[PDB]
Amino acid sequence: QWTLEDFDIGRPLGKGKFGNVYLARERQSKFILALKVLFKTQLEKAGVEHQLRREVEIQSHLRHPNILRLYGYFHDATRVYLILEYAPLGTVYRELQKLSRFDEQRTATYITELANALSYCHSKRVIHRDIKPENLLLGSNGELKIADFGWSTLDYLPPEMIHDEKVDLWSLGVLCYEFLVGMPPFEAHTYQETYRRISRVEFTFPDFVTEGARDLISRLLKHNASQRLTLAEVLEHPWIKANSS
Numbered sequence: 001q002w003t004l005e006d007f008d009i010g011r012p013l014g015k016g017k018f019g020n021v022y023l024a025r026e027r028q029s030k031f032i033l034a035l036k037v038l039f040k041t042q043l044e045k046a047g048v049e050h051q052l053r054r055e056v057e058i059q060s061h062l063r064h065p066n067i068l069r070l071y072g073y074f075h076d077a078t079r080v081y082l083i084l085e086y087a088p089l090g091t092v093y094r095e096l097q098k099l100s101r102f103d104e105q106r107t108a109t110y111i112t113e114l115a116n117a118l119s120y121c122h123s124k125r126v127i128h129r130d131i132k133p134e135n136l137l138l139g140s141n142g143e144l145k146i147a148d149f150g151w152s153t154l155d156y157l158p159p160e161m162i163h164d165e166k167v168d169l170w171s172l173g174v175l176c177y178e179f180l181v182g183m184p185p186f187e188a189h190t191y192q193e194t195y196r197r198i199s200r201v202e203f204t205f206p207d208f209v210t211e212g213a214r215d216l217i218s219r220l221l222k223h224n225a226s227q228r229l230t231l232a233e234v235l236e237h238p239w240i241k242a243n244s245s
């Protein structure tokens with residue numbers, strides 16, 4: 001039975017779609033966490049109030065080092081509060097912008113962590129949609145954490161979304177490419193060109209992308225969703241094996 005006065009509120013972490021997220025301390029435990037505040041009126045205007053309840057119910061049963069932990073949740077009358085794990089090292093997107101690109105070791109390790117988290121949920125009959133780098137947070141140990149509401153931008157959508165269990169495989173291909181190159185593979189100057197690139201699966205590798213990486217990405221980025229390299233096969237990939245930590 002959590003209440004708002006059980007928490008001391010610190011700095012805002014960022015503005016979002018339905019509200020704000022803050023650094024916070026639970027008063028009894030002195031534990032550092034993130035409190036996500038979502039306004040009910042905005043959820044009602046979008047018509048996602050029931051969707052959020054079902055989402056939060058799923059996440060409350062998910063316990064994996066590479067999925068952001070939901071410790072609990074509560075409401076008052078106008079706001080919905082989510083008690084979330086705090087990630088001290090920020091987003092993977094920000095890390096990518098700072099370095100411009102990741103090396104093979106970091107890329108393979110992130111993909112392994114993603115595949116592990118998605119495989120864990122698969123055994124619990126839980127599926128994920130598209131994955132964005134801004135929704136991947138980094139813990140103190142340098143481990144990636146999936147932090148979104150996709151448990152059940154055009155640049156990250158598969159051809160079928162422009163769909164069921166195989167969306168996340170396309171996402172892994174896009175992310176692996178972006179981690180190594182610094183930009184998503186279907187990046188274009190217009191919406192129409194970006195749409196065409198995705199639908200026709202038209203992407204190219206710069207010269208610095210190694211053959212092992214190219215093989216992994218090409219097996220992932222297929223129009224035929226059922227023929228995409230699966231989570232088990234990704235973890236078993238020669239390039240992943242050789243480069244993951």
Ligand SMILES: CCCCNC(=O)c1cccc(NC(=O)CCCCCNc2ncnc3[nH]cnc23)c1
Binds near residue numbers: 015017036086091
């Ligand atoms: C899909 C729609 C629902 C909602 N999400 C939101 O409305 C929403 C509300 C507030 C913020 C955001 N996201 C953002 O503003 C993304 C920017 C990143 C902020 C840093 N966030 C965190 N840094 C470290 N540890 C954490 N644990 C949980 N979050 C964090 C999103």
